[PDB]
Amino acid sequence: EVETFAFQAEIAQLMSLIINTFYSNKEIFLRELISNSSDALDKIRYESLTDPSKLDSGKELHINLIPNKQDRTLTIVDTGIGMTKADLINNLGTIAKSGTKAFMEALQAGADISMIGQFGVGFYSAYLVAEKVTVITKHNDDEQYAWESSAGGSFTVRTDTGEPMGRGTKVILHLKEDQTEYLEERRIKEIVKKHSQFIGYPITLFVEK
Numbered sequence: 456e457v458e459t460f461a462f463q464a465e466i467a468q469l470m471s472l473i474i475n476t477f478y479s480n481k482e483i484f485l486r487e488l489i490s491n492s493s494d495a496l497d498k499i500r501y502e503s504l505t506d507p508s509k510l511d512s513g514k515e516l517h518i519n520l521i522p523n524k525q526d527r528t529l530t531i532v533d534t535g536i537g538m539t540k541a542d543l544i545n546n547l548g549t550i551a552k553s554g555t556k557a558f559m560e561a562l563q564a565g566a567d568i569s570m571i572g573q574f575g576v577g578f579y580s581a582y583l584v585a586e587k588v589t590v591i592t593k594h595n596d597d598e599q600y601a602w603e604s605s606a607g608g609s610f611t612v613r614t615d616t617g618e619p620m621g622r623g624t625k626v627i628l629h630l631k632e633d634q635t636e637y638l639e640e641r642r643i644k645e646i647v648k649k650h651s652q653f654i655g656y657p658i659t660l661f662v663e664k
């Protein structure tokens with residue numbers, strides 16, 4: 456059973472701006488997704504201080520970067536707090552509305568797309584490099600879900616029947632045909648070192664076979 460939802464008009468507008476604007480410095484998408492993963496990890500770690508049982512779904516706090524050339528995907532996996540169904544449909548988008556308006560105003564005043572994370576809507580930079588984004592997520596208080604959007608104004612949510620993740624979030628970037636440099640080990644290594652070198656969780660860059 457697949458549910459289809461419309462983005463808020465303001466978020467659709469943000470996504471079209473990201474897709475349509477000419478802007479060569481696309482690599483910052485990775486910093487933004489890793490930053491989100493670090494925030495999610497910080498959150499479950501803080502909650503576990505007063506309720507250790509929140510780590511019964513997995514003690515390890517880490518980020519994995521997994522390229523796959525056959526599928527032309529780059530996956531950013533974390534074992535952070537995860538997202539509930541309400542997070543996926545409502546909560547994050549509610550919070551994103553104000554960040555989007557501020558980001559739009561900053562751009563008109565001379566900011567650039569690389570500053571998107573300073574407004575709390577860095578996730579949508581994924582559409583600098585991906586034609587489709589799939590998000591698999593599992594929060595301790597909810598079931599495992601799959602969210603997906605190719606932009607165009609809509610997204611879907613369904614219960615996920617794939618491999619159980621335990622707890623956390625996988626962001627699967629279905630890369631655009633001209634963005635496959637982000638599958639290469641040396642390129643990902645370079646970007647992590649430049650923009651994410653002090654993240655307080657181990658980042659493991661998987662190798663392809």
Ligand SMILES: COc1ccc2c(n1)C(C)(C)NC2=O
Pocket residue numbers: 490491492494495533535536537538578624
């Ligand atoms: C990467 O997984 C998550 C899970 C929950 C949350 C987030 N990311 C952000 C976007 C940092 N805000 C949340 O509430």
Ligand SMILES: COc1ccc2c(n1)C(C)(C)NC2=O
Pocket residue numbers: 491542543544547548551578590602624626
């Ligand atoms: C997976 O990490 C995130 C971060 C921010 C956001 C999202 N996911 C969705 C739920 C797609 N909407 C957001 O604003």
